Design a protein around this ligand. Structure first.
Ligand SMILES: [Mg+2]
Ligand SMILES: [Mg+2]
Ligand SMILES: [Mg+2]
Ligand SMILES: [Mg+2]
Ligand SMILES: [Mg+2]
Ligand SMILES: [Mg+2]
Ligand SMILES: [Mg+2]
Ligand SMILES: [Mg+2]
Ligand SMILES: [Mg+2]
Ligand SMILES: [Mg+2]
Ligand SMILES: [Mg+2]
Ligand SMILES: [Mg+2]
Ligand SMILES: [Mg+2]
Ligand SMILES: [Mg+2]
Lengths: 145, 87, 217, 182
RNA sequence: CGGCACCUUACGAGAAAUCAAAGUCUUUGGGUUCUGGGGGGAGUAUGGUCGCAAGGCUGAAACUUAAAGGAAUUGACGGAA
RNA sequence: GCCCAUUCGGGUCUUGUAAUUGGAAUGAGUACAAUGUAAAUACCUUAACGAGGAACAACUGGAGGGCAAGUCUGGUGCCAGCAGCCGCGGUAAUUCCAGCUCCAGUAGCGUAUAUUAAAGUUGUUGCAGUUAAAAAGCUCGUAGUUGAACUUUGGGUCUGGU
């Protein structure tokens, strides 16, 4: 068996073409090419996005572990799209409140779900210009209302 | 193998098969030393003197081994009429 | 509490086989374990991992423990021993014994130029077990044991000081990987070089020579 | 617009974090040659690593032929000057295996302690930090100085400051003042 | 000499069933075409094109999910023997 | 470590712990000066003051595995939460929330997204296609890619080097 690919000394262009063709099966590559992040993906293919807290929503978790996961329905400012952001640590949701500006981040999985929280893709990071972790700690205090 | 100026490094310097040349490994459990006693005139097999042959294991497994041995013997001068050059 | 079966064992006891080198040369089997110990006092025995392992039964399951052990020194000898028993310590012991029985030499060669003492492999050698191919490429000096942790450990045990690897297929089948590595190591002595073109004498074995001392009375 | 001032993120982390044995070894090394962090060790490794790479490259060409002959030789000379290489070993293939320990041993860290002066590694380091020790007659206060061997005999206590014995130094002065008052 | 075909060892292979090719591959390169890149969403949406149609060829993404598979081992089981 | 170990013990020699205490520096701070400088700052240089746990105070993350390090104590009791993944939670939590310990890195360390490595999981080097995804149902066939062996081999005679 010569094994598929042409092993000729002048078979280079063909090989290149083949490689290119193959490239469209690789998912990451495809994404990079087509601008799926730029055309979809609530964020603009960005790390973060500021968004308005439309409402506090407890979401029921996937399976095995059973609980309500204190998420927030956020409306992204730049695009106008509506997403659901999980809110970390104990309480935290109280701190976040309602109708606040909220700086979101990706959850970890380059999109996709994060473990058990179904239909949820984002960590709330900052609420109206602080930081959720900090608030939880009480190392830093909130700037009043 | 030979460091600096001789000083033979690497022990266990292996038995190489008589038929194949093929190195006989440390755990070549199949490979064999045949000892053929040295002949003398009118009976007599001369105690403590042999033509020693090593056979690798691969050959034995194949069954091409006996023939090889015979050939070797012929080459040496332990046989006549047995192993022909052409078949 | 010694007492040997095996002609070879008897010979060893007597004290006419000096080192394991002779044994290796005459590819003599070592079904008994103590012989190896006698020969080589510097056997470092290191347990690599222990899988729990379960046959399924009409009621419950049969938990046993596949203990993998690597044995060595820094001379150029290694042993790989696998056993699966229910008592863990016992299993480990068994594995160790197996490794000892195996113990196999390694041709340690030169990186490039002779200069000092050799502590890499001679040739690009590779092994295989299931879907693990461990390929050991000889390193330069000081460049270390570039390998998967288990593999590295094995190399250390052997007395290979510097080496490159390329472990491919499912390396996380740890035992399998180890086996592959062992195979590769073995293949070192077996790969013919131009150093060994020259013809050897074929020495008589200890089993032939010291035949009266071996065997029972 | 002048020109980019160049730098190197010189001193590089290992590829796994928690190889336990490795960590232990590092710790031991630190203990031996009183380092503040693993960072120093990493730096040392990088330094040595580069050298090793260079050696390898040289080998990959024919010794007798030119670049290999010359550049390699130069490197060897440099190493000798530094005092990591021995005088028995000047054959390039010896550099190939230098080891980090050796490198550590050449520091003004240890070349204080090795020559007495301090008493106990850490103490020496402290002394170096606190504006004592002049390798020439110019006050080194970097622990990771790397002594030149050619200027290792010249390592003294500082011309100025105590221990060298120019001025007694602050606490002593205070004590004297107190005595006077009394 | 030719196509529609068993046994052992495999040193050759192979994840193994097995394979005299599914061998001469980490000791990696005889010459070529074509196809595949976790599972689903989906042979769908869309556009093309081909058709009398039914359908065909061509062929997505969003979104979703930690398994989907393969081979076998021991079990358990079977209105199998 | 031990001169000796009829029991001790001196402790002749070397190390670690105590809000003991004591002498010796220190520059981080400040500050005449002088340096710098276009003028200044800041640096380097100096006088003078400035360290003893109350400071002249190191944070970040983690402490089941992957993966270095707690089967510690309470608070909780499918909750609230952690958890990249595996997963932990249902009155015995080493995974949640606090103290102590402890680890890792250290004036840095975390998180997010990209991206490179790892990925021989894009493969020319270097993958797979009997069954795991994968051989067009079959043959024909232009481009392309490739394509059997054969023409000057061998010997001498000097002559430069390394
Ligand atoms: Mg559940
Ligand atoms: Mg001063
Ligand atoms: Mg898919
Ligand atoms: Mg902390
Ligand atoms: Mg935590
Ligand atoms: Mg905790
Ligand atoms: Mg651990
Ligand atoms: Mg508890
Ligand atoms: Mg890549
Ligand atoms: Mg693949
Ligand atoms: Mg298929
Ligand atoms: Mg088909
Ligand atoms: Mg079809
Ligand atoms: Mg031709």
């Amino acid at each position: 068996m010569g094994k598929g690919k042409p092993r000729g000394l002048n078979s280079a262009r063909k090989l290149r073409v083949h490689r290119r063709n193959n490239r469209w099966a690789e998912t990451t590559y495809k994404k990079r090419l087509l601008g799926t992040a730029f055309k979809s993906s609530p964020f603009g293919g960005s790390s973060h996005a500021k968004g308005i807290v439309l409402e506090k929503i407890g979401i029921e978790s996937k399976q095995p572990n059973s609980a309500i996961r204190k998420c927030v329905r956020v409306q992204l400012i730049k695009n106008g799209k509506k997403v659901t952001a999980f809110v970390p640590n104990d309480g935290c949701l109280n701190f976040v409140d309602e109708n606040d500006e909220v700086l979101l981040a990706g959850f970890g999985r380059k999109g996709k779900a994060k473990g058990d929280i179904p239909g949820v893709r984002f960590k709330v990071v900052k609420v109206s210009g602080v930081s959720l972790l900090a608030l939880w700690k009480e190392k830093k205090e909130k700037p009043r209302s | 193998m030979e460091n600096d100026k001789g000083q033979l490094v690497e022990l266990y310097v292996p038995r190489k098969c008589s038929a194949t040349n093929r190195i006989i490994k440390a755990k070549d459990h199949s490979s064999v030393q045949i000892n053929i006693a040295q002949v003398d005139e009118e009976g007599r097999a001369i105690p403590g003197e042999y033509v020693t042959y090593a056979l690798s294991g691969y050959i034995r497994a194949r069954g091409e081994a006996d023939d090889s041995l015979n050939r070797l013997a012929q080459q040496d001068g332990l046989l006549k009429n047995v192993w022909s050059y052409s078949r | 509490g010694w007492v040997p079966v095996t002609k070879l064992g008897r010979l060893v006891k007597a004290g006419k086989i000096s080192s394991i080198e002779e044994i290796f040369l005459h590819s003599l089997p070592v079904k008994e374990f103590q012989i190896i110990d006698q020969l080589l006092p510097n056997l470092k025995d290191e347990v690599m991992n222990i899988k729990p392992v379960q046959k399924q039964t009409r009621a419950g399951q049969r938990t046993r423990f596949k203990a993998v052990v690597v044995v060595g020194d820094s001379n150029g000898h290694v042993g790989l021993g696998i056993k699966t028993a229910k008592e863990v310590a016992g299993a480990i012991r068994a594995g160790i014994i197996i490794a000892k029985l195996s113990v196999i030499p390694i041709r340690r060669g030169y990186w490039g130029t002779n200069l000092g003492q050799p502590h890499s492999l001679a040739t690009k050698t590779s092994g295989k077990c299931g879907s693990v191919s461990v390929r050991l490429i000889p390193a330069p000096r000081g460049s270390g044991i570039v390998a998967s942790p288990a593999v590295k450990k094995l190399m250390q045990l052997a007395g290979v000081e510097d080496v490159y690897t390329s472990s491919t297929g499912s390396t996380r089948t740890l035992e399998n990987t180890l086996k592959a590595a062992f195979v590769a190591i073995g293949n070192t002595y077996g790969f013919l070089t131009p150093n060994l073109w020259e013809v050897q004498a074929l020495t008589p074995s200890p089993m032939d020579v010291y035949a009266d001392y071996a065997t029972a009375s | 617009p002048r020109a980019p001032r160049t730098y190197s993120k010189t001193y590089s982390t290992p590829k796994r974090p928690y190889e336990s044995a490795r960590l232990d070894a590092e710790l031991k090394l630190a203990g031996e040659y009183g380092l503040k962090n693993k960072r120093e060790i990493y730096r040392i490794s990088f330094q040595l690593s580069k050298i090793r790479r260079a050696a390898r490259d040289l080998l990959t060409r024919d010794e007798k032929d030119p670049k290999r002959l010359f550049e390699g030789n130069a490197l060897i000379r440099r190493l000798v000057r530094i005092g990591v290489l021995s005088e028995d070993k000047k054959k390039l293939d010896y550099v190939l295996a230098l080891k980090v320990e050796d490198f550590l041993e050449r520091r003004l860290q240890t070349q204080v302690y090795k020559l007495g002066l301090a008493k106990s590694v850490h103490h020496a380091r402290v002394l170096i930090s606190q504006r004592h020790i002049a390798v020439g007659k110019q006050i080194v206060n970097i622990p990771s100085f790397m002594v030149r061997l050619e200027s290792e005999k010249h390592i003294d206590f500082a011309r100025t400051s105590p221990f060298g014995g120019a001025r007694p130094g602050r606490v002593a002065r205070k004590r004297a003042a107190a005595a006077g008052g009394e």
